[PDB]
Amino acid sequence: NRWVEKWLRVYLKCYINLILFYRNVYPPQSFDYTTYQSFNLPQFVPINRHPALIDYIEELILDVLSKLTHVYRFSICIINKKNDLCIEKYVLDFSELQHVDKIITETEVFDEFRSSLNSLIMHLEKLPKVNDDTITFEAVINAIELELGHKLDRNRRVDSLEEKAEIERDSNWVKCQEDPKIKLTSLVGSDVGPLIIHQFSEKL
Amino acid sequence: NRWVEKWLRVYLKCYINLILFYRNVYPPQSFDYTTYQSFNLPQFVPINRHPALIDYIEELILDVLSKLTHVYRFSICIINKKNDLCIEKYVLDFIITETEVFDEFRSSLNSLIMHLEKLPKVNDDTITFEAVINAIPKIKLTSLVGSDVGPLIIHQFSEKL
Amino acid sequence: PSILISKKRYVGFSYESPSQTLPIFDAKGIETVRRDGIPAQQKIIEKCIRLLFQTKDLSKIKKYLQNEFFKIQIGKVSAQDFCFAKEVKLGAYKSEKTAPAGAVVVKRRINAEPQYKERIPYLVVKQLLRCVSPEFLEGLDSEYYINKILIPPLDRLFNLIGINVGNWAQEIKRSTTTLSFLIKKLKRQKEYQTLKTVCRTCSYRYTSDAGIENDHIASKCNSYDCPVFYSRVKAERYLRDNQSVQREEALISLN
Amino acid sequence: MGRINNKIDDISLIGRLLICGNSVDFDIKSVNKDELMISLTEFSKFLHNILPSISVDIMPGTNDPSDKSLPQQPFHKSLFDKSLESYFNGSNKEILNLVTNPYEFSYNGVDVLAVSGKNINDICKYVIPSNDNFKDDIEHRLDLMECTMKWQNIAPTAPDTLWCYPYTDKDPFVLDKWPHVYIV
Amino acid sequence: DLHMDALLTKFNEDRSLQDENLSQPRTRVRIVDDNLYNKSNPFQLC
Amino acid sequence: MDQKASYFINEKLFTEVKPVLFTDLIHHLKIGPSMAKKLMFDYYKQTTNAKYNCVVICCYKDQTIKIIHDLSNIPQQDSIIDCFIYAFNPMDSFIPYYDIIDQKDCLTIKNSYELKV
Amino acid sequence: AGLRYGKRAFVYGEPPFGYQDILNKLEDEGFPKIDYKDPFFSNPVDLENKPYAYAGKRFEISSTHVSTRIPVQFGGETVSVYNKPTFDMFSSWKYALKPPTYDAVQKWYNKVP
DNA sequence: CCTCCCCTAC
Ligand code: SF4
């Protein structure tokens, strides 16, 4: 957790921004290609410049990093708005992540991130174009041993910003279930020492 | 089957207040919006300020749960004035511990909030409600999340003419 | 929205017509309309009142007040909004000890005489209160200014709500460092160049010249009524400040 | 490097490469160290990948991290990647050379005067209600440069380009020897 | 006047593959600066 | 060699998704630019399963270098002095990445001076 | 014409108040017609028990945060969980916060900030 | 608590 958090946050930011841009979740005019977005990105990743969207993405990534000790799968679901049905699912496996109980040069980490993001972009390019006008996205995680929404039964008298952040992050999730022609396409992840991440995608 | 009664009472009160506020059945600035929390949800749950309406809602809920075995469908209908037509209709069908029933009630309320927040606005002084209990044209139906772990599985769905 | 402090003292948003959309900031008797202080207190009070009336959020007001207090303590203020101006009556004073601060400033300046009933600048910045004239520029204990200029009026305005402002104020080979040094130095230099260009353009009114001897004339302007003069003198002082030691440190690191 | 043209007989005649400023573009009003460091690392990668084949001379620019005035001193030994530390030991100056913004290279006896263009750019920011008989054309700027040589003054607009204390009793911007080639 | 593949076939198949020993690369022409160490750089200030 | 180069290109194009340049072949196989371009052209053939985008650039007269985009109307075809394949792009946006390269013995032109330590 | 109730359906009593009479009835009961927002803290950290007293006047300053909001009560008595939560293995969870709308981003971009 | 001084409201 020394340098793992920063690289993981950068990778999550690149992943979310690429998925938003290439699936037309937000207008392409609001995205710009850049390498610095308060962190040196491994590539020229198109990052949205809407302040509310940036804050939302950063908060979600921080929450996921906080809960990383108990979550083994992070998914961004693409759901239509005419009906609440998921049409595309991108799964980011976290099978123990090779957690650093006790850390490697940044160059190889960025090279592996470049390979994984290039695989993701190559998969996304061949997908059919998605129309504008109310296509939206959704975030779902798969947990091992946790229970959220139950930390507000003691009146949670906050004292500092850390306690308020913990309370708001515990209460910002709801319980969901596991739920044809589902097509599974495995992608390229990172095989570096500290970070062992597997990438998946779903269609239909 | 003990705490399901109290949690269903709270969930039904939230259901009725949310439907009355998000739709324009009763005017805004008549609900208590920034004081209560429903199921530890981050959203603001509105509660009607008039004690008489709250008491009437509580009596309705108590009457519904009194004959819960005989009912298989509890629904609330939205009737437009001068036409007496159901513009929209929100319908819910029908070893368990605290945590699971609490969780599915929280999820169902969150799904209802999500569905209600993205609905078109409604004009003023044009809508009245009607609660119907069931004992035994072009329609748009929306499927919502309901409780399934407990033996009293409910199905939440909404309709729109 | 309205606040009634005392007799002939109130502030609120006025709507002279129902068709009017933007509220009008109407104040009567509070420090915003009183010329018995400094522009900084008027601006701070107006901003706090507008925030309270629009958002009703005490957290935003506390954040703004803490940020302003921190800026004042650091020394990042405009240095112009901290100048007092009160009328002086040189012959209507019962005794020398009863004269106000501005009378003492004028008496020091005379030893030249002013005219009767003049708004005179006093107490610019930096042991009784009885008096530096805006001798400051050729010459600040932020605690005194903060407390005795902002705590009383903000406390008068907010004790009606039930919050103590004083509690908020109580809390209050190397390519890394050298790059930051160049960033700071270049930002300062560009700000100074922009100020000089603005001064030259303004002095063009009298000089009607563009080349040399126009900037030389503009550099001799000592107008105390324009913030650009204060910004220019601050930048000039900062260029001749300890940055010379910073330049020496960069030279050692580069070598 | 001759990788594209594939005619070594002509590529090998390009003795030196000259960068005349504006290596990196950024907003100095709102900038931090990280993004500028990324840009300088990219520049250092390019230099390291081009240095073994050709010599490089680098000039400060208007938006480069150097002094806002016109006599901009050489950049630093720092602000470059550690892979270039061998070129900065002092003994290797013929292959890499960081130089003042105005300079007179004696390229094989051909004296060439190089200016990053701040003087002409500062002259062009003035609208002069005269010279009725070009508007933002190459001919007008060429005439301005020719006048600059005629007046023997590199920076006619001293308050705009020049800074405090250029020199004492001997301003270098007043020409003392015409060069063979003039570059703006 | 022709498709891209035609031009690629015309140009690439007739590659010279000559003078590219890569063991004795051609030396770049020598260009020197006589002002590297002479004296008194006029624009070098403190 | 038409075998090592093809294997390297296939690996760098499919196993680790990254655009491959002819300069990559120059640095890997220790060959001159002409041989690298010929090998790239050879790999362009025998490609019945085409799963990449070719980035081709041409050299005009008067020392002008252009990147082909339209691929249907190339201006001034009579003035072309050379045309080759610059890279194989597995994605749509080229955007390559550049790293530190040790050109110990792959240089075709060297400066008259040598690095002195 | 309208939506059918079903095979067997019962109806409850008519609500006592309408759309226009609700505010008048609320005012008659002794409540203000419109309850304007009192001064409040958006950040619960900045609460610090400030509203204790002011010159013998007690003020009630609360927060709109989730932590400080009283749970919805039924029958005049608060309802809350007493037993400790029982986590189950292999659970799935969903983010509740709503992302910005496509139309909002389009409008922000078209305004040319 | 006292006078002195500032200066805004009505
Ligand atoms: S007065 Fe203000 S504006 Fe006029 S010159 Fe002096 S500084 Fe520039």
Side-chain angles (χ1 to χ4, degrees), chain A residues 105-110 112-116:
Chain A
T105 187
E106 167 171 89
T107 80
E108 320 170 304
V109 176
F110 278 168
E112 284 295 332
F113 284 173
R114 200 164 309 115
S115 280
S116 159

Side-chain angles (χ1 to χ4, degrees), chain C residues 198-199 202 221 223 226 228-229 232:
Chain C
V198 171
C199 293
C202 189
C221 170
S223 187
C226 187
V228 182
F229 167 71
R232 164 161 56 83

Side-chain angles (χ1 to χ4, degrees), chain A residues 150 153-154, chain B residues 3 97-99, chain G residues 80-81 83 85-86:
Chain A
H150 288 255
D153 303 281
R154 282 86 68 180
Chain B
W3 293 271
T97 61
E98 292 285 349
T99 300
Chain G
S80 54
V81 178
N83 289 319
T86 79

Side-chain angles (χ1 to χ4, degrees), chain C residues 92-93 95 98-106 108 110 112 114-116 118-121 127-137 139-140 142 144-147 149-160 162 164-169 175 177-184 186-211 214-224 226-233 235 238-239 242 244:
Chain C
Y93 293 151
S95 73
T98 58
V104 190
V105 182
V106 163
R108 191 160 67 250
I110 285 176
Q115 69 276 17
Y116 182 76
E118 183 178 1
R119 309 211 73 101
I120 62 170
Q127 186 64 256
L128 262 55
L129 188 153
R130 176 175 325 132
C131 279
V132 291
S133 66
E135 311 155 320
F136 181 76
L137 274 297
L140 75 166
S142 296
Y144 159 75
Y145 313 81
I146 285 182
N147 299 328
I149 304 176
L150 309 173
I151 296 305
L154 290 173
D155 269 344
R156 279 196 294 271
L157 279 169
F158 284 153
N159 283 18
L160 306 193
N164 224 338
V165 182
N167 303 336
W168 297 351
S175 291
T177 45
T178 77
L179 191 59
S180 159
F181 273 140
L182 280 71
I183 287 187
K184 297 212 300 283
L186 272 298
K187 182 184 304 176
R188 293 181 184 271
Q189 285 183 357
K190 196 180 190 307
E191 189 213 10
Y192 177 50
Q193 283 189 347
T194 299
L195 297 182
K196 295 212 101 160
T197 302
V198 171
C199 293
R200 187 187 300 111
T201 317
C202 189
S203 161
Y204 185 86
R205 169 190 296 270
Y206 296 154
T207 56
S208 292
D209 191 3
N214 188 6
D215 184 37
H216 178 80
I217 283 172
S219 66
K220 290 180 294 187
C221 170
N222 54 339
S223 187
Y224 289 100
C226 187
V228 182
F229 167 71
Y230 296 90
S231 80
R232 164 161 56 83
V233 300
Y238 283 19
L239 265 293
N242 62 6
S244 45

